[PDB]
Amino acid sequence: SMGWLHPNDKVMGPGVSYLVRYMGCVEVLQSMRALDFNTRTQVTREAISLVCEAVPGAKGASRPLSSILGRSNLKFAGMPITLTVSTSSLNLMAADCKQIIANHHMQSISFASGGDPDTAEYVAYVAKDPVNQRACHILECPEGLAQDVISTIGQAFELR
Ligand code: NA
C-alpha cells in the first residue's frame, strides 16, 4: 500500500511490462507547470473523457478546458499493447509484439495521473513526441494495474 512496487534495478534496466489498451491521445496546448495541480488533474480527467466517448468499448464511456486540450488522435486508439516502463522511456508495443506505437522518452513526461472513481482503471500522461507534440496519452488498464502503472512511471522518472 506504500511506496514503489518494483525493484529499482528492474525499472533502471529492462523496465517493467504491463498489458494495457492504448486509448489514443489529446493534444495539450499549455505547459503543465503553468497550471495548478487541481487544473492539471482536470485536464487529464477531461482527456480521459474525450477518448472514452469516441473509442468503442471504452470502460469509462461545449467541452471544458478547450484552451488547454486540443484535438484527439485516434489512429492507434483501442489497440492492446505491451507497455514497458523504464528509466529510458514509456515504450508502447502492438499485439504482434513487434511494431512500436510510440516510445516516449522519460525526460519528456511532464505529468502523470489516474482518473477518478468512475475512471479508476485509466492512466493519463503528458509527453512530447515528434508526431503528437505535447499530448496527453490515455491507457486503459486491467483491474488493479492502473495504480501500479502510475507509481512505476514516477519511479522511472525519479531513477532516470
Ligand atoms: Na538502463
Side-chain angles (χ1 to χ4, degrees):
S1 44
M2 271 304 276
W4 286 340
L5 288 323
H6 303 285
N8 293 348
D9 289 2
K10 183 144 189 234
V11 175
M12 293 168 76
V16 178
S17 294
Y18 306 92
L19 305 200
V20 303
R21 189 177 189 214
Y22 184 63
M23 299 299 274
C25 66
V26 181
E27 189 180 26
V28 170
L29 305 169
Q30 180 54 294
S31 184
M32 297 295 273
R33 82 194 50 261
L35 312 167
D36 65 75
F37 180 86
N38 172 248
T39 299
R40 288 175 209 149
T41 299
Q42 292 172 16
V43 172
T44 57
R45 174 67 192 89
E46 173 64 12
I48 291 160
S49 168
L50 286 161
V51 307
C52 286
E53 297 298 332
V55 179
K59 304 315 192 166
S62 72
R63 60 194 204 75
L65 307 156
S66 51
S67 75
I68 301 159
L69 286 163
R71 198 142 60 154
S72 295
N73 177 19
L74 300 180
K75 267 172 52 145
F76 299 114
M79 291 186 71
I81 58 165
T82 304
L83 171 72
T84 304
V85 180
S86 73
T87 52
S88 320
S89 73
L90 304 189
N91 182 270
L92 290 62
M93 182 174 70
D96 69 8
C97 290
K98 290 187 183 163
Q99 193 208 332
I100 294 309
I101 300 319
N103 190 66
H104 290 127
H105 295 168
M106 189 55 43
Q107 170 169 18
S108 82
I109 306 301
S110 61
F111 189 73
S113 84
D116 62 9
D118 301 325
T119 44
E121 72 274 75
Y122 291 89
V123 182
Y125 66 89
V126 176
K128 312 216 188 180
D129 72 71
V131 173
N132 293 297
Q133 322 307 336
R134 198 161 53 232
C136 182
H137 299 274
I138 312 304
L139 312 173
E140 179 184 275
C141 302
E143 188 213 306
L145 293 187
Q147 287 317 127
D148 183 333
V149 174
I150 291 151
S151 172
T152 311
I153 287 173
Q155 181 178 14
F157 185 82
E158 190 50 48
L159 293 171
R160 83 204 181 294

